[PDB]
Amino acid sequence: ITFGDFND
Amino acid sequence: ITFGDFNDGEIE
Amino acid sequence: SMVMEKPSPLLVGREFVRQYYTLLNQAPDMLHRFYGKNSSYVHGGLDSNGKPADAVYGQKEIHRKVMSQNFTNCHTKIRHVDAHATLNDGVVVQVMGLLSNNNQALRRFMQTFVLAPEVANKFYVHNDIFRYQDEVF
Amino acid sequence: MVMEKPSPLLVGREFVRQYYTLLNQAPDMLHRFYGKNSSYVHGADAVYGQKEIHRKVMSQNFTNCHTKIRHVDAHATLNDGVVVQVMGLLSNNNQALRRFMQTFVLAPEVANKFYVHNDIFRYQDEVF
């Protein structure tokens, strides 16, 4: 669902 | 380089 | 409330490829945030004497080479995604499809990723190899 | 006597050369390149380890494989392993050349000796 720097 | 399972020589 | 089984490397891989290429349509000037440092990156192209361009490394030198490729309305078609568990907790994701930049025409490409763990259950891009066919064939 | 230092793109380029030269000299020995818990994905589903890879390679009746490799990309990866992407053409049984992508992840075993842990392969022909 989420990768890297990204914030769910 | 040598790879895997082969003795130097029979690689080529 | 409901608890479901964790995604499989094949499912993790296709879902990254999905997230990746839609972002590159929506806002490619964020695409560097999939990468950490030590992150390989080449996305096609040729150099001076006609040979295939070389790689850039690290989250920041990616954000530079990503924006000189000025992406605009990237319409993309994945025909195939194949992904498997790797060394450590990683995933390698061979990808094949069709990318179109700047309303220029569709071009076939051949891509490999390596997605690596960092929370520890989050995945980042450690390597990314992309190549158009018409620049290599 | 004379001493230097090594390289990923060099290991990657070295390995390829040998992969596709043994692929023509003796496919019946292509398996010895791989270790335990390796993946062989040819075309389709995966197979694992020395014995099964050897049997899948058999079944595909590689006979007189010729290759033209057009570009090799290699980069160090996790374990100080190496990830390679190759693009080029393969022919089999004296047929005509078919454009192919192949992805190797190479992993260290012993001093200075790599083994293949993941091997995905597909042709242009039956993708786009």
TrEMBL record, chain A:
Parent-record interval covered: 1806 to 1813 of 2299
Reported function: RNA dependent RNA polymerase. Replicates genomic and antigenomic RNA by recognizing replications specific signals. The early replication complex formed by the polyprotein P123 and nsP4 synthesizes minus-strand RNAs. The late replication complex composed of fully processed nsP1-nsP4 is responsible for the production of genomic and subgenomic plus-strand RNAs.
Subcellular location: Host cell membrane; Host cell projection, Host filopodium; Host cytoplasmic vesicle membrane; Host nucleus
Biological source species: Chikungunya virus (CHIKV)
Protein name, UniProt field: Polyprotein P1234
Lineage summary: Viruses, Riboviria, Orthornavirae, Kitrinoviricota, Alsuviricetes
Chain segments annotated as transmembrane: none
Assembly information from the UniProt record: Interacts with RNA-directed RNA polymerase nsP4. Interacts with mRNA-capping enzyme nsP1. Interacts with KPNA1/karyopherin-alpha1; this interaction probably allows the active transport of protease nsP2 into the host nucleus. Homododecamer. The enzyme forms a membrane-associated dodecameric ring with a central channel for the exchange of between the viral replication factories and the host cytoplasm. Interacts with non-structural protein 3. Interacts with RNA-directed RNA polymerase nsP4. Interacts with protease nsP2. Interacts with itself. Interacts with host STING1; this interaction results in inhibition of cGAS-STING signaling and increased levels of palmitoylation and protein stabilization of nsP1. Interacts with host TMEM45B; this interaction leads to viral replication inhibition.
Superkingdom of the organism of origin: Viruses
Secretion signal span: none
